[PDB]
Amino acid sequence: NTITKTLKLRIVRPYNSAEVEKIVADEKNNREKIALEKNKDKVKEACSKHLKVAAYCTTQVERNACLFCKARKLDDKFYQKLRGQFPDAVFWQEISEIFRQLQKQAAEIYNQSLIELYYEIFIKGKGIANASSVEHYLSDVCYTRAAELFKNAAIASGLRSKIKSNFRLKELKNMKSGLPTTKSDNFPIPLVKQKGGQYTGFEISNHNSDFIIKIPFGRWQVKKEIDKYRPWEKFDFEQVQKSPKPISLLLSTQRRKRNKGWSKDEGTEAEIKKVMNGDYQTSYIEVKRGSKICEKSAWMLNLSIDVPKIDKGVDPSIIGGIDVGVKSPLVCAINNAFSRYSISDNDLFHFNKKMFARRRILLKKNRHKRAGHGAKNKLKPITILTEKSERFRKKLIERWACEIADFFIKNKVGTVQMENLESMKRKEDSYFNIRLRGFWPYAEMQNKIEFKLKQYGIEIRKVAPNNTSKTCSKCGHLNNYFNFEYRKKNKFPHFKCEKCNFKENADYNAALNISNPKLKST
Amino acid sequence: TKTLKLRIVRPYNSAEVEKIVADEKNNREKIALEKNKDKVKEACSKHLKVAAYCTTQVERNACLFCKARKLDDKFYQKLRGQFPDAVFWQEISEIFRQLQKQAAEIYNQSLIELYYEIFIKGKGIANASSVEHYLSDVCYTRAAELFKNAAIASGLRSKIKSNFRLKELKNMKSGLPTTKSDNFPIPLVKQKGGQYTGFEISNHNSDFIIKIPFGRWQVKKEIDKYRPWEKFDFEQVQKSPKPISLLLSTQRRKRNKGWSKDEGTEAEIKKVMNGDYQTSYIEVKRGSKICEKSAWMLNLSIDVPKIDKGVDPSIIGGIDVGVKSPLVCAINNAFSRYSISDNDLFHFNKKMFARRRILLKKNRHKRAGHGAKNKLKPITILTEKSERFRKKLIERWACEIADFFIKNKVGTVQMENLESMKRKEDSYFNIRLRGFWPYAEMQNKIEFKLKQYGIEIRKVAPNNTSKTCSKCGHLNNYFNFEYRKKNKFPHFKCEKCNFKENADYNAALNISNPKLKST
DNA sequence: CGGCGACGTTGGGTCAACTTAAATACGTA
DNA sequence: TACGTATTTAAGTTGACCCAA
RNA sequence: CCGCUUCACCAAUUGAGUGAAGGUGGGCUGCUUGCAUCAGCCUAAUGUCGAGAAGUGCUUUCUUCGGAAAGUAACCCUCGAAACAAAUUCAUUUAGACGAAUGAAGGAAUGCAACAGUUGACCCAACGUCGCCGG
DNA sequence: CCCCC
Ligand SMILES: [Zn+2]
Ligand SMILES: [Zn+2]
Ligand SMILES: [Zn+2]
Ligand SMILES: [Zn+2]
């Protein structure tokens, strides 16, 4: 009945108190008054918003070239004054050292507690374990070690949920996988705090149109003798019941207030307005690093969120279908309505070929290229393009999914059937393996279209894919001549029926056969 | 160490049982012949010559005779009733799967119990003596009492001792490598040194016979319901010996196509039987390639000493410029080319010409009042940095070329002469980069990097290369440069020899010929 | 530049699982 | 006793491949 | 210059061809992302280096199968290093110039389109060396 | 056993 999501927000700064933030806001307003009175007709770069409240000038500038906006920025002498004046305040050096230490010890506890679970279940408990015995062993092992290190209960139960997400019991009993280990460096901090029924969850306050989140935390004390092999470990984290000290964080919604739908009811901005209202409680929080934005890393925060379904006036008596192809990207059909949709944008397949070709050039003769300073340094140009290509892929798939969903909602289509495609991964074909496997995300496309349709109350039926491209959509003749080897050697032609003389596209015919409700779901 | 992987098509029973099986395939072929007096017309790929009366050919795979020549399960079942010692591919597939799952279980649980005893209950203070104590007191004894072979026990103990990396696990650079019990190999250590030749491998008609000593495998009197895969017992080696003989083939699929003979392992197996190359490690594992996942493949690991050759002056190499790549290397009697790629040069030049086109456009109005001198400040430095880039690129190319000639064991490289190198319309330079290249610095750094490694240079300077073929000295004069430009730079096709190869490589071959004297 | 066998790094496909719920110490109103 | 927030705890097996080029 | 875009042409979509115009033809920051534009900047960047010693390797010593110590630094060894703006401080030549730091706290666009994210497992592919076989 | 080059 509810659909789970995450919101990704950027941490502006740690929020501190109400008196220290009153001092910060008044120092910003004092600098604004100082620059608003010292620039007495000396400058004329008042920004369009700054003309209204107080300025006496003519022209409008881009808000980057304002001088009263520029003066509101606080320097480092004010923050060493505030660290001296309020020594119980919370600033970024403590916070970034805590967050990096949390990340590294959460990865270490994840590894050691999965190995300890494998011991207690399979070596000590002789393999005898149900699923509820895995629930007991998770809360008895992973929570207990994580709460023996971090005396938070939020981090310890978040690490229990992170180990629970990746511990598969019968796959490790039947030896169908290896035991999971982390090698990652940006491992999240998983941070559950319960939200059902009589609980609220993490206590998001909205002070002056801001996104303040509060993290229940202990009183950190710097280690006396810091270890020289592991110098990131320099805090102690007392118990949250003995001596609490909750880290509040301000989260970046200033850019999102300029976005086109913030005064709407459906986007990511309406979800953030609802979380700001006190609707849409969150029970899950992940803190990760972003990219190194000017030699100091950005920290992002993911708010898991449970969202209802939207009405849209959409009924399951109208049935649609989607044919996932590599030549033609995505073609949507309706069962009886003579309506049709066909993607025509830039393609993810051509983009994957281009990125693979460039990656082949850059890897092609590495031995003297940038040698001598490690594996990470050596493969630096490719990874910078891998982040950008993953972002471009994801945004292209999401734009295709919104075009598909806008088509299907415009025709009031309630059930979209799709192909099963659970057997494609097992294919022994050399061509598929070497030329089509890693460059054609059919299932990531399918999952994002299931997600986008599921947000609107549209059901998705995985429909068995046998003889779908060759059966005719008018009179279901099952043209057996229209095999894949004939679709190959005829250079992938239109569909021609043998007893109807029916002529439509090969990707639209299989879209209108996928749309048929008679086929058995799988 | 070299690991040579073979297939297993079937076990080798004995002389008499394999005689009965081969006579049964011949008798089924004879009965399928005499019941079909030209009913169907498949005729096999070549059985048409020996004994068939049928019209057209088939690929041997859609024939009628082979699907009768493929035996039936019940025949092997009545043979297993009639012969108690004959081993077949269903029973030994069960034994291989159960031994794979057992050894993977012992390996996984021994790594996790090592990690527990060392890093969790033992607070991270544990030398390798505690690892050797755990192995020889717990894991070797467990593997020597579950399956009583000392080969699989001392192979599992060695695979865990080598695969448990204490120095990399103490500092948490890595985690534990745990497997999937289909990718796990069954180790089977025996000695290499002197007395033990190792597993007593013999030969067949383009096949091999490996005689692993093993046990008797009485079936369990009551299968354990909660572990249903463990259905054998593995009685001891010295009490009831029953050595498995397997039949090993070199055939592999050409990416799921027909069987090609792999001669790269086959030569090494010939060196095994001839008396040298004593083997010491026979792993059994499932196949990893496509259309081989249900095939049991047998890796012979064999140890060779790290012995260099040096360079020998009989091998003669050559460097010549190309038209799509700046430098092509070649050896006369081998294939062995090494074409230096263009893309980093091309993209450096693309960015340098973009910076030139920009700094010569936004100087006419901005840089003004002081003359052209104000304009000239930026370019002098960009081209200086470009020359330093070209110098580092030429040093990288010299490193690549010298690594190529050391790996391919070349002792004397013959380069074209300097003025004959630069006066060339068949170069990548003078077509794209109009003149801007240090040929003298390039040749001096290639000469110095090669003379660092004890390789001579010769300066042969041919009269007319880039159209003379190598296999015959034809002087194919139809290679005009103006012909090459209009025909989109085509390959080298010999007229009388029909030798199809690259136009860069045969031109790199005519420099490497020793029949033309130094100049 | 093609195969074949190891080891190593990476990228990048599918797929699975998480984003729970009841009870209780410790403290306060 | 009502409420809040941080803390802890929930239990027991049961393969899989289907082939002698 | 373009293995850059568009238009016109020729030969048979490749030319890494002819002509005219235009443009980083590679990136960074602009407050979650993508594309285009805009302001500023870097660019030898598919580059060149710094510091180290946990590991692979290598040398020496030791009961020396195992393994440990010390060192060397080849490594697809570890960590890093270009790129918006206001502010602050110092040195040096004659208000200006250079070197140059300490750093986060909403100082930074416009338009269109979006905005579940993380962890792990399995598999395939590319590449690097290391050996064998063939034309 | 087809869905996809
Ligand atoms: Zn302003
Ligand atoms: Zn029809
Ligand atoms: Zn025959
Ligand atoms: Zn010839």
Author numbering:
A (entry chain A): 4 to 525
B (entry chain B): 7 to 525
Text of the article:
Cas12f, also known as Cas14, is an exceptionally small type V-F CRISPR–Cas nuclease that is roughly half the size of comparable nucleases of this type. Cas12f associates with a crRNA and a tracrRNA, which can be fused into a single guide RNA (sgRNA), to target substrate DNA. An asymmetric Cas12f dimer is bound to one sgRNA for recognition and cleavage of dsDNA substrate with a T-rich PAM sequence. Despite its small size, Cas12f contains all the conventional domains of Cas12 proteins, compared with other known Cas12 nuclease structures.
We assembled a Cas12f–sgRNA–target DNA ternary complex by incubating an inactive Un1Cas12f1D510A (529 amino acids or a.a., 61.5 kDa)(10), a sgRNA (222 nucleotides), and a target dsDNA with a TTTA PAM sequence (60 bp). Using cryo-EM, we determined the structure of this complex at 3.1 Å resolution. The most astonishing feature of the structure is the presence of two copies of Cas12f in the complex (named Cas12f.1 and Cas12f.2), in contrast to all previous determined structures of other class 2 effectors. The PAM sequence is recognized at the interface of REC1C and the WED domain. The PAM proximal end of the heteroduplex is primarily recognized by Cas12f.1, whereas the PAM distal end is bound to Cas12f.2. Interestingly, the lid motif in Cas12f.1 is in an open conformation, in correspondence to the crRNA–target DNA heteroduplex formation. However, the lid motif in Cas12f.2 is in a closed conformation, although this active site is closer to the 5′ end of the target strand. Two purine bases from the Stem 2 of tracrRNA, G(24) and A(62), insert into the inactive RuvC catalytic pocket, likely further inhibiting substrate access. Interestingly, we observed an extended density assigned as the substrate DNA trapped in the RuvC active site of Cas12f.1, likely from excess DNA oligos used in complex assembly. The rotation of C(4) and the close proximity to the triplet of acidic residues indicate the phosphate group connecting C(3) and C(4) is the scissile phosphate targeted for cleavage.
